[PDB]
Homo-oligomer: 281 residues x 3
């Protein structure tokens, strides 16, 4: 199923009939960082499997719902169970949910993820406001927009120079200062590693040479689809480890360690993004 | 349809029966740089859709013709409407037209493209004679030759050390001097970005670190297929902008700007390559 | 055919019924480096085409056998005719033979390959004990584990920090010293170039900047599948040329030159790995 105008409209039609919510904000939460989705008011949960033309996710398994409702008086839509390209999903499957958000009226997309630290000033538990990216799949002919262009949504050759909105990064830093945890907030460049293997020690050393501050396996595909169709983005990474230090000390990383850091910061991140939603222009 | 010996011979058979032209020179022109194709004498236009085994291009749309005729007394064949891998074409679809050129007797392939400037000595409107490349898709398992080797055309493991003929670069520079625009002519290394997104600001900073002089979304796949089957190549890039300066100044690039630069240089480039064809050994 | 638990068990069942050998060591030999497979005692040769669920290799052609028997008193299994991803094989086809080795009881995998030299201290004919890698396909969304995870074999997000066993590198160096050819033995980082084109001169210059010591077109996919399911690996590269020197001198490389170096070192490498097998803990 192609992520074209007709197929996305069919999905959005079903969603409208069921929810009666017209959102202008969208949110995609990282693994272990989805608690805010349980605080949505007057909410409506829609499993992907019931939405026309939505991708099939049974092979991967686990939760997959679209959740609509109110937060801080604002109308939002959330992806509960996000799609990763290391699972084998195609460009079309990743893009369609984002283009459905567009047809529903979304103008701002907030994203969180877990990532490894490359910059030496980064430690486990820090936050990184993403200001740019290095898209290794894109350079290597696996860009999320490879294929026919869907002209109704955006141009053939999009410019990514302003994909990470400056004002939204400023508003997020301001809230960190009002609550006195700005010491945890950095900015940096995000490198996209297709995955699913964690970056090797020598791959981490390479990324340091190339000016990368963090590395992860998500986010960039959704950012490009949102920028293509004119949606503003804020993306924040939670640092689970510093891969450069681990390589120098012969220390390992694993998913169990990643999720422990997520649990330690989940509540502060929930509080942080709830206020962001409330304060959005 | 595979780009094998049998399928390419079928296409070349049709072309011979229709044109009566046996060319030894081939040309692939960049976007907005195809005016010379309208100056071909005693010409014959063949739309791709009528040639057996030629790839289907209706989804992408726009012009797609093979044009044969005479220029400067030399017999040539031109691709009017070239195939880009960011459209979703397979390795086999990109390769077959080049291997048809081979069976028709082509020994020299001239190529032009539009690209972004990485080297700080490059400005909008300059020309770059390509002397080598960095093939990011090739490193990442999307090389144009991934698949079974077609032994009739070339070896399993080709050497690209002489893919960009030295003498042809010299002849092109000589003509620039005779007409006194050598101040516009550089040489440099071409980085292949799969696309279709323009290189991001931080991707441009990375390419500077790696020794790249220009970046574009084409050319390298055709060069590799031509080098595989023993065809000499000259490739020239037209610089539409300097991506490093744009990143430092927070300036954008877009297709509308690219085509404006193409229009400003199209006539000088036509004059330039017409003489090259006439002067080829 | 997916490289899942059920399909791999079917293949291993056939192999058990035919050989009566239960190996705990596996070996994959590089091109021109397979002579040791002719020295296997009480051996049993099984062509891939007869083993259920094994990948089809007729298009590529050439030898493809699984060989079981005894070496130095140890029980081994060998892949005679290895699969390269530049031929067009899928992730599933590359992985299944390795996961069959696992179900047969393999705990150690020994691998040899031919590669180009990037580090300036490397010359034609040297050996390189691989201690890490840079996986360009993996960064670019062509990792061998892209797809659904086969939970019975390993985790979703494996850590590659210890994929190249330290003790095995030490044992291999020790044997080189006992026979007084340690002057040929280096250690270094292996860059994975998808291929099948040899690295271009400017790609070699890039890899030097990035800290790569050697470059080749194999090994990394098998290493990742073995590390995923808990198999220890030793990997050794034979250097056929120094790509940096060749680029500075405008010298070419080709397969004929590669195989000549392989012939010159094949007997010493056979002797070397026979003792390694005998001395494994
Ligand atoms: N901690 C971590 N490291 C790498 C990565 O891709 C995700 N998370
Ligand atoms: N001006 C420009 N920049 C990048 C590119 O790939 C093409 N053209
Ligand atoms: N000699 C050589 N060089 C490169 C390569 O990929 C294999 N062998």
């Amino acid at each position: 199923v192609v992520a074209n105008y007709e197929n996305a409209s069919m999905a959005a039609d079903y969603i409208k009939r069921v929810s009666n919510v017209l959102p202008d904000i969208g949110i995609i939460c990282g693994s272990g960082l989805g608690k805010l989705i349980e605080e949505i008011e007057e909410r409506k949960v829609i499993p992907y499997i019931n939405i026309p033309n939505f991708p099939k996710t049974t092979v991967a398994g686990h939760v997959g719902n679209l959740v609509l409702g109110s937060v801080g008086g604002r109308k939002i839509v959330a992806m509960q169970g996000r799609l990763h390209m290391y699972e084998g999903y195609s460009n079309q499957e990743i893009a369609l949910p984002i283009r459905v958000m567009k047809l529903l009226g979304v103008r701002v997309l907030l994203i969180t993820n877990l990532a490894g630290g490359i910059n030496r000033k980064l430690k486990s538990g820090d936050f990184v406001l993403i200001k740019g990216h290095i898209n290794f799949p894109g350079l290597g002919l696996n860009n999320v927009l490879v294929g026919p262009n869907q002209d109704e949504f955006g141009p053939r050759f999009p410019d990514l120079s302003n994909a990470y909105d400056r004002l939204l990064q400023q508003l997020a830093l301001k809230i960190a200062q009002e609550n006195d945890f700005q010491d945890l907030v950095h900015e940096g460049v995000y490198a996209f590693n297709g995955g699913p293997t964690y970056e090797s020690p020598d791959e981490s050393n390479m990324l340091l040479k190339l000016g990368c501050d963090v590395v992860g396996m998500s986010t960039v595909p959704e950012v490009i689809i949102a920028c293509h169709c004119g949606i503003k983005v804020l993306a924040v990474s939670l640092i689970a480890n510093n891969s450069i230090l681990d390589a120098e000390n012969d220390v390992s990383i694993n998913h169990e360690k990643v999720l422990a850091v997520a649990e330690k910061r989940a509540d502060l991140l929930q509080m942080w993004f709830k206020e962001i939603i409330t304060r959005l222009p």
